[PDB]
Amino acid sequence: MGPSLDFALSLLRRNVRQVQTDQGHFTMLGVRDRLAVLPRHSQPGKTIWIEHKLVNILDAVELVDEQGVNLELTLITLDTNEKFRDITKFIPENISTASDATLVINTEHMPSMFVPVGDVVQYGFLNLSGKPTHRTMMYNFPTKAGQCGGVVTSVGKVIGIHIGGNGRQGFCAGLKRSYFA
Ligand SMILES: *[C@@H](O)[C@H](C[C@@H]1CCNC1=O)NC(=O)[C@H](Cc1ccccc1)NC(=O)/C=C/c1ccc(N(C)C)cc1
């Protein structure tokens, strides 16, 4: 088996978890220690279902930029038994585009799912369901409901978390390594 599939499957085993909140099913990316990231609109509460058990959330931080605008990312600290493998090194230091990226999803309804979103380009401002968001990127793929929190990945880099789509295109919140310092 080659390196790109090995990388994604290893993400699916060690960092990319099936979750459910009151808002439905999402993919959650565990980044290091007991710190994970979800799309803000998943609205995690005091507990979250993670695969096979209910896990307590010890803190949730909704990220905004210096203008006060939503980044659509919520960092949660979990009462998990074990620490995540630290994947912060795979997150670029600036928000970064990619060629021929794949969106890797993992929910109870869409387990171990691979979506060929393709080139990922800078987008910036997005108004989704009424809320302004900054720092997004875009792919010309018709993503659908249930795929939020999916991990946008390319050549060993974890670059984005899926947050929205308009039927023809998909959008992620860009990831940068400093969100997880
Ligand atoms: C994941 O939960 C989901 C994935 C979307 C659903 C449709 N395709 C996808 O890829 N995301 C959403 O439903 C988001 C949620 C959101 C809320 C607030 C801030 C950021 C994200 N919303 C959307 O993707 C918007 C969908 C939409 C609304 C209205 C229209 N009409 C045509 C104006 C089109 C699309």
Distance from residue 165's CA to the centre of ligand 1 (Å): 5
> Which is it for strands 24-32 and 16-21: parallel, antiparallel or unpaired?
antiparallel
Q: What does the angle CA 148 – CA 47 – CA 76 come to, to the nearest 5 degrees?
A: 60
- Chain breaks after residues in the chain, where C lies over 2.5 Å from next N: none
Active-site option among 25, 72, 134, 172? 72
Q: What is the rounded CA–CA span in Å between residue 49 and residue 71?
A: 24
Q: Which of 141, 178, 144 is nearest to 163 (CA)?
A: 144
Q: Which of 73, 92, 7 is nearest to 35 (CA)?
A: 73
Determination technique used:
X-ray
- List the end-to-end C-alpha distance of the chain, in Å, as a whole number: 33
Q: Which of 129, 114, 122, 132 is nearest to 172 (CA)?
A: 122
Q: Which residue has the tokens 């609205």?
A: 43
Active-site option among 25, 134, 148, 162? 148
Strands (E), the chain: 16-21, 24-32, 35-39, 47-50, 53-64, 70-78, 98-105, 113-128, 131-139, 151-154, 157-165, 170-174
Stated resolution in angstroms? 1.5
Tell me the one-letter amino acid at 56. Answer: N
Domains of the chain, start order: 1-15+85-181 (2.40.10.10), 16-84 (2.40.10.10)
Q: Which of 103, 109, 140, 148 to probe ligand 1 with, by most ligand atoms within 8 A of CB?
A: 148
Decide if 148 contacts 140 (C-beta within 8 A). no
Q: What does residue 180 show for φ and ψ, rounded to 5 degrees?
A: -110, 10
With a 6 Å cutoff on the Cβ, whether 41 touches ligand 1 is yes
CA dihedral 114, 152, 51, 60 (to 10 degrees): -160
With a 6 Å cutoff on the Cβ, whether 160 touches ligand 1 is no
Distance from residue 169's CA to the centre of ligand 1 (Å): 11
Whether 172 is catalytic is no
